[PDB]
């Protein structure tokens, strides 16, 4: 599910065939390579790509491996990162934020004011020191989490994940 690595720099002339060969040479379980081509000449790539592995284990072993100095792929010029699902979506994706580390003085209203900046809230539900924040659309949750995570609310650094759906 988390099975894709981001690769920050590859030679922009290399085809998807050649990227598969190169990275398949030095890691196990490589299963796909997702390339974007320079729209002005479809034959070149945009200088980055995604590596897909059969599972998250494999992708995880591969990342460690490519990050070790133990082996070199086209110079190791850029970083190899986990892919960010926020960044490349894809189906009812989750528009509920789970917020923890809520200071004593934080109310449902204060939560509404702070999180309303990013899009229409459907409901704020505060518990003891954590809260559920229902956004009308996923894009509002994505923005709220990106901008608010780790931020100070009433003296407390709040921590934000997408909620686990009860389904």
Curated annotation (Swiss-Prot):
The modification N6-acetyllysine is found at residue 120. The modification Phosphotyrosine is found at residue 130. Keywords: Acetylation, Cytoplasm, Endoplasmic reticulum, Host-virus interaction, Isopeptide bond, Methylation, Microsome, mRNA processing, mRNA splicing, Nucleus, Phosphoprotein, Repeat, Ribonucleoprotein, RNA-binding, Spliceosome, Translation regulation, Ubl conjugation. It is found in: Cytoplasm; Microsome; Endoplasmic reticulum; Nucleus. One of its GO terms (biological process) is negative regulation of nuclear-transcribed mRNA catabolic process, nonsense-mediated decay. The keyword Phosphoprotein applies. Phosphorylated on tyrosine. The membrane-bound form found in microsomes is phosphorylated in vitro by insulin receptor tyrosine kinase (INSR). Phosphorylation is inhibited upon binding to RNA, whereas the cytoplasmic form is poorly phosphorylated. GO terms for molecular function: mRNA 5'-UTR binding; RNA binding. Ubiquitously expressed. Detected in heart, brain, pancreas, placenta, spleen, lung, liver, skeletal muscle, kidney, thymus, prostate, uterus, small intestine, colon, peripheral blood and testis. Its main location: cytoplasm. Isoform 1 is a component of the APOB mRNA editosome complex and interacts with APOBEC1 and A1CF (APOBEC1 complementation factor). Part of a complex associated with the FOS mCRD domain and consisting of PABPC1, PAIP1, CSDE1/UNR, HNRPD and SYNCRIP. Isoform 3 interacts with HNRPR. Interacts with POLR2A hyperphosphorylated C-terminal domain. Isoform 1, isoform 2 and isoform 3 interact with SMN. Isoform 3 interacts through its C-terminal domain with SYT7, SYT8 and SYT9. The non-phosphorylated and phosphorylated forms are colocalized with PAIP1 in polysomes. Interacts with HABP4. The domain containing eight Arg-Gly-Gly repeats (RGG/RXR-box) may be involved in RNA-binding and protein-protein interactions. It is methylated by PRMT1, and essential for nuclear localization. Heterogenous nuclear ribonucleoprotein (hnRNP) implicated in mRNA processing mechanisms. Component of the CRD-mediated complex that promotes MYC mRNA stability. Isoform 1, isoform 2 and isoform 3 are associated in vitro with pre-mRNA, splicing intermediates and mature mRNA protein complexes. Isoform 1 binds to apoB mRNA AU-rich sequences. Isoform 1 is part of the APOB mRNA editosome complex and may modulate the postranscriptional C to U RNA-editing of the APOB mRNA through either by binding to A1CF (APOBEC1 complementation factor), to APOBEC1 or to RNA itself. This is Heterogeneous nuclear ribonucleoprotein Q. It comes from Homo sapiens (Human). The lineage of its organism: Eukaryota, Metazoa, Chordata, Craniata, Vertebrata. The chain holds residues 242 to 410 of 623 of the full protein.
């Amino acid at each position: 599910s988390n099975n894709r690595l981001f690769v920050g720099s590859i030679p922009k002339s290399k085809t998807k065939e050649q990227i598969l060969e190169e990275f398949s040479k030095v890691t196990e379980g490589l299963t796909d390579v997702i390339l974007y081509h320079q729209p002005d000449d479809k034959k070149k790539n945009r200088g980055f790509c995604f590596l897909e592995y059969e599972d998250h284990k494999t992708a995880a072993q591969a990342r460690r491996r490519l990050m070790s100095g133990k082996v070199k792929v086209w110079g190791n010029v850029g970083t190899v990162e986990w892919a960010d699902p926020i960044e490349d979506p894809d189906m009812a994706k989750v528009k509920v934020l789970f917020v923890r580390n809520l200071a004593n003085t934080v109310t449902e209203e204060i939560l509404e004011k702070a999180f309303s900046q990013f899009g229409k809230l459907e409901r704020v539900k505060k518990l003891k020191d954590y809260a559920f924040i229902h956004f009308d659309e996923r894009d509002g949750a994505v923005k709220a989490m990106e901008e608010m995570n780790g931020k100070d609310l009433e003296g407390e650094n709040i921590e934000i994940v997408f909620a686990k759906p009860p389904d």
